[PDB]
Scaffold this motif. Structure first.
Motif, PDB file in Angstrom:
ATOM      1  N   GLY A  10       0.618  -4.747 -21.388  1.00 15.02           N
ATOM      2  CA  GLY A  10      -0.303  -4.206 -20.405  1.00 15.02           C
ATOM      3  C   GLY A  10      -0.018  -2.752 -20.083  1.00 15.02           C
ATOM      4  O   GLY A  10      -0.939  -1.971 -19.845  1.00 15.02           O
ATOM      5  N   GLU A  11       1.260  -2.389 -20.071  1.00 14.74           N
ATOM      6  CA  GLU A  11       1.662  -1.020 -19.772  1.00 14.74           C
ATOM      7  C   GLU A  11       1.567  -0.141 -21.016  1.00 14.74           C
ATOM      8  O   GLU A  11       1.167   1.021 -20.940  1.00 14.74           O
ATOM      9  CB  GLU A  11       3.090  -0.993 -19.224  1.00 14.74           C
ATOM     10  CG  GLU A  11       3.305   0.049 -18.138  1.00 14.74           C
ATOM     11  CD  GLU A  11       3.443  -0.566 -16.759  1.00 14.74           C
ATOM     12  OE1 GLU A  11       2.404  -0.884 -16.143  1.00 14.74           O
ATOM     13  OE2 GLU A  11       4.591  -0.729 -16.294  1.00 14.74           O
ATOM     14  N   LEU A  12       1.937  -0.705 -22.161  1.00 16.49           N
ATOM     15  CA  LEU A  12       1.894   0.027 -23.422  1.00 16.49           C
ATOM     16  C   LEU A  12       0.520   0.650 -23.644  1.00 16.49           C
ATOM     17  O   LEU A  12       0.408   1.765 -24.155  1.00 16.49           O
ATOM     18  CB  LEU A  12       2.239  -0.904 -24.586  1.00 16.49           C
ATOM     19  CG  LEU A  12       3.327  -0.411 -25.541  1.00 16.49           C
ATOM     20  CD1 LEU A  12       3.088   1.044 -25.916  1.00 16.49           C
ATOM     21  CD2 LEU A  12       4.704  -0.583 -24.916  1.00 16.49           C
ATOM     22  N   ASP A  13      -0.522  -0.076 -23.255  1.00 18.89           N
ATOM     23  CA  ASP A  13      -1.890   0.407 -23.409  1.00 18.89           C
ATOM     24  C   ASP A  13      -2.030   1.825 -22.866  1.00 18.89           C
ATOM     25  O   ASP A  13      -2.840   2.613 -23.355  1.00 18.89           O
ATOM     26  CB  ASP A  13      -2.866  -0.526 -22.690  1.00 18.89           C
ATOM     27  CG  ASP A  13      -3.983  -1.004 -23.597  1.00 18.89           C
ATOM     28  OD1 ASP A  13      -3.746  -1.940 -24.389  1.00 18.89           O
ATOM     29  OD2 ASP A  13      -5.096  -0.443 -23.513  1.00 18.89           O
ATOM     30  N   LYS A  14      -1.234   2.146 -21.850  1.00 20.77           N
ATOM     31  CA  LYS A  14      -1.268   3.470 -21.240  1.00 20.77           C
ATOM     32  C   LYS A  14      -0.428   4.459 -22.039  1.00 20.77           C
ATOM     33  O   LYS A  14      -0.789   5.629 -22.173  1.00 20.77           O
ATOM     34  CB  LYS A  14      -0.761   3.401 -19.797  1.00 20.77           C
ATOM     35  CG  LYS A  14      -1.814   3.759 -18.764  1.00 20.77           C
ATOM     36  CD  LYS A  14      -2.236   2.544 -17.954  1.00 20.77           C
ATOM     37  CE  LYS A  14      -3.245   1.692 -18.711  1.00 20.77           C
ATOM     38  NZ  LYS A  14      -3.271   0.289 -18.213  1.00 20.77           N
ATOM     39  N   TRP A  15       0.693   3.983 -22.571  1.00 17.53           N
ATOM     40  CA  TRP A  15       1.583   4.826 -23.359  1.00 17.53           C
ATOM     41  C   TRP A  15       0.913   5.260 -24.658  1.00 17.53           C
ATOM     42  O   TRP A  15       1.066   6.401 -25.094  1.00 17.53           O
ATOM     43  CB  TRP A  15       2.885   4.084 -23.665  1.00 17.53           C
ATOM     44  CG  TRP A  15       3.760   4.798 -24.650  1.00 17.53           C
ATOM     45  CD1 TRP A  15       3.870   4.539 -25.986  1.00 17.53           C
ATOM     46  CD2 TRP A  15       4.646   5.889 -24.376  1.00 17.53           C
ATOM     47  NE1 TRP A  15       4.773   5.402 -26.559  1.00 17.53           N
ATOM     48  CE2 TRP A  15       5.262   6.240 -25.593  1.00 17.53           C
ATOM     49  CE3 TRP A  15       4.979   6.602 -23.222  1.00 17.53           C
ATOM     50  CZ2 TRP A  15       6.191   7.273 -25.686  1.00 17.53           C
ATOM     51  CZ3 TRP A  15       5.901   7.627 -23.316  1.00 17.53           C
ATOM     52  CH2 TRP A  15       6.498   7.956 -24.540  1.00 17.53           C
ATOM     53  N   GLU A  16       0.173   4.342 -25.272  1.00 13.25           N
ATOM     54  CA  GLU A  16      -0.519   4.633 -26.523  1.00 13.25           C
ATOM     55  C   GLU A  16      -1.801   5.420 -26.266  1.00 13.25           C
ATOM     56  O   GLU A  16      -2.513   5.792 -27.199  1.00 13.25           O
ATOM     57  CB  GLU A  16      -0.845   3.334 -27.263  1.00 13.25           C
ATOM     58  CG  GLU A  16       0.373   2.650 -27.858  1.00 13.25           C
ATOM     59  CD  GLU A  16       0.037   1.324 -28.513  1.00 13.25           C
ATOM     60  OE1 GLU A  16      -1.017   1.239 -29.177  1.00 13.25           O
ATOM     61  OE2 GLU A  16       0.829   0.370 -28.360  1.00 13.25           O
ATOM     62  N   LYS A  17      -2.090   5.671 -24.993  1.00 13.27           N
ATOM     63  CA  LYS A  17      -3.284   6.414 -24.611  1.00 13.27           C
ATOM     64  C   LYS A  17      -3.003   7.913 -24.571  1.00 13.27           C
ATOM     65  O   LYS A  17      -3.923   8.727 -24.625  1.00 13.27           O
ATOM     66  CB  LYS A  17      -3.788   5.942 -23.245  1.00 13.27           C
ATOM     67  CG  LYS A  17      -5.268   6.200 -23.021  1.00 13.27           C
ATOM     68  CD  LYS A  17      -5.501   7.507 -22.282  1.00 13.27           C
ATOM     69  CE  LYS A  17      -6.666   7.399 -21.312  1.00 13.27           C
ATOM     70  NZ  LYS A  17      -7.944   7.086 -22.011  1.00 13.27           N
ATOM     71  N   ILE A  18      -1.725   8.268 -24.478  1.00 17.35           N
ATOM     72  CA  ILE A  18      -1.324   9.668 -24.434  1.00 17.35           C
ATOM     73  C   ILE A  18      -1.287  10.274 -25.833  1.00 17.35           C
ATOM     74  O   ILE A  18      -0.704   9.700 -26.753  1.00 17.35           O
ATOM     75  CB  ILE A  18       0.059   9.837 -23.777  1.00 17.35           C
ATOM     76  CG1 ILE A  18       0.039   9.289 -22.348  1.00 17.35           C
ATOM     77  CG2 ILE A  18       0.473  11.301 -23.782  1.00 17.35           C
ATOM     78  CD1 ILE A  18       0.892   8.053 -22.164  1.00 17.35           C
ATOM     79  N   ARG A  19      -1.911  11.437 -25.985  1.00 18.67           N
ATOM     80  CA  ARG A  19      -1.949  12.122 -27.272  1.00 18.67           C
ATOM     81  C   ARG A  19      -0.612  12.791 -27.572  1.00 18.67           C
ATOM     82  O   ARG A  19       0.254  12.892 -26.700  1.00 18.67           O
ATOM     83  CB  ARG A  19      -3.068  13.164 -27.286  1.00 18.67           C
ATOM     84  CG  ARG A  19      -4.446  12.576 -27.541  1.00 18.67           C
ATOM     85  CD  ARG A  19      -5.413  12.909 -26.416  1.00 18.67           C
ATOM     86  NE  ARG A  19      -6.700  12.242 -26.585  1.00 18.67           N
ATOM     87  CZ  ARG A  19      -7.649  12.674 -27.409  1.00 18.67           C
ATOM     88  NH1 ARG A  19      -7.455  13.765 -28.136  1.00 18.67           N
ATOM     89  NH2 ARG A  19      -8.795  12.012 -27.507  1.00 18.67           N
ATOM     90  N   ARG A  21      -0.464  15.901 -29.810  1.00 23.12           N
ATOM     91  CA  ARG A  21      -0.737  17.332 -29.866  1.00 23.12           C
ATOM     92  C   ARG A  21      -1.831  17.716 -28.875  1.00 23.12           C
ATOM     93  O   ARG A  21      -2.555  16.868 -28.353  1.00 23.12           O
ATOM     94  CB  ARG A  21      -1.152  17.739 -31.281  1.00 23.12           C
ATOM     95  CG  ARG A  21      -0.044  18.421 -32.069  1.00 23.12           C
ATOM     96  CD  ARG A  21       0.170  17.756 -33.419  1.00 23.12           C
ATOM     97  NE  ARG A  21       1.529  17.955 -33.916  1.00 23.12           N
ATOM     98  CZ  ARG A  21       1.889  17.738 -35.176  1.00 23.12           C
ATOM     99  NH1 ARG A  21       0.996  17.317 -36.062  1.00 23.12           N
ATOM    100  NH2 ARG A  21       3.145  17.941 -35.553  1.00 23.12           N
ATOM    101  N   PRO A  22      -1.957  19.025 -28.608  1.00 23.45           N
ATOM    102  CA  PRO A  22      -2.959  19.551 -27.677  1.00 23.45           C
ATOM    103  C   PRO A  22      -4.378  19.427 -28.223  1.00 23.45           C
ATOM    104  O   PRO A  22      -5.261  18.878 -27.567  1.00 23.45           O
ATOM    105  CB  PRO A  22      -2.569  21.024 -27.530  1.00 23.45           C
ATOM    106  CG  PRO A  22      -1.844  21.351 -28.790  1.00 23.45           C
ATOM    107  CD  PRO A  22      -1.127  20.092 -29.193  1.00 23.45           C
ATOM    108  N   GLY A  23      -4.590  19.943 -29.431  1.00 16.08           N
ATOM    109  CA  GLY A  23      -5.903  19.880 -30.044  1.00 16.08           C
ATOM    110  C   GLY A  23      -5.970  18.862 -31.166  1.00 16.08           C
ATOM    111  O   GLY A  23      -6.797  18.976 -32.069  1.00 16.08           O
ATOM    112  N   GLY A  24      -5.095  17.863 -31.110  1.00 18.10           N
ATOM    113  CA  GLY A  24      -5.074  16.836 -32.136  1.00 18.10           C
ATOM    114  C   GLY A  24      -5.716  15.543 -31.675  1.00 18.10           C
ATOM    115  O   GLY A  24      -6.393  15.509 -30.647  1.00 18.10           O
ATOM    116  N   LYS A  25      -5.505  14.476 -32.437  1.00 19.67           N
ATOM    117  CA  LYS A  25      -6.068  13.172 -32.103  1.00 19.67           C
ATOM    118  C   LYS A  25      -5.007  12.081 -32.196  1.00 19.67           C
ATOM    119  O   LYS A  25      -5.303  10.898 -32.030  1.00 19.67           O
ATOM    120  CB  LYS A  25      -7.236  12.845 -33.036  1.00 19.67           C
ATOM    121  CG  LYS A  25      -8.292  11.958 -32.399  1.00 19.67           C
ATOM    122  CD  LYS A  25      -9.590  12.715 -32.168  1.00 19.67           C
ATOM    123  CE  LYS A  25     -10.321  12.979 -33.476  1.00 19.67           C
ATOM    124  NZ  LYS A  25     -11.598  12.217 -33.560  1.00 19.67           N
TER     125      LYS A  25
END
Ligand SMILES: *C(=O)CCCCCCCCCCCCC
Length: 131
Positions: A10-19, A21-25
């Motif tokens: 449930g928490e990981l979903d947030k961790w994997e939400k952070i990019r 690089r700045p202009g990356g994906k």
């Protein structure tokens, strides 16, 4: 030991939400959560600090003044730990850039507030003349 890494699904979903690089994906993956925790142990820092948002606050502080002394390895950590603290404070960053800055800018605001109370202590005696 018997179990590594805290942040659950449930928490990981947030961790994997952070990019990454700045202009990356690119996003963040468990690999990073571990790659960092495995560093604290060697950095004389307990891995049980990343479990709480407050714990990280103390970590970033130590590595802060080391961002210059430490090697490239010390830089990769700050960029990581920074993303974690944000995840625990319910803060959603845009990438490893907006995250690091979001924390670096917060320390600059506290610096003034920390050296502002000295005024209230000093003598406040004004004076003005007139016709
Ligand atoms: C066995 O005792 C090893 C213990 C491993 C430490 C737990 C990892 C810390 C929690 C995740 C770190 C979060 C970093 C984004």
């Amino acid at each position: 030991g018997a179990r590594a890494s805290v942040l659950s699904g449930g928490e990981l979903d947030k961790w994997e939400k952070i990019r990454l690089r700045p202009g990356g994906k690119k996003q963040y993956k468990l690999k990073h959560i571990v790659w960092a925790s495995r560093e604290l142990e060697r950095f004389a820092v307990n891995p049980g600090l990343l479990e709480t948002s407050e714990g990280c606050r103390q970590i970033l502080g130590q590595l802060q003044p080391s961002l210059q002394t430490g090697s490239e390895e010390l830089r990769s950590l700050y960029n990581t730990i920074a993303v974690l603290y944000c995840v625990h404070q319910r803060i959603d960053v845009k990438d490893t850039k907006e995250a690091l800055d979001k924390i670096e800018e917060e320390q600059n605001k506290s610096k003034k507030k920390a050296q502002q109370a000295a005024a209230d202590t000093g003598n406040n005696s004004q004076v003005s003349q007139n016709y």
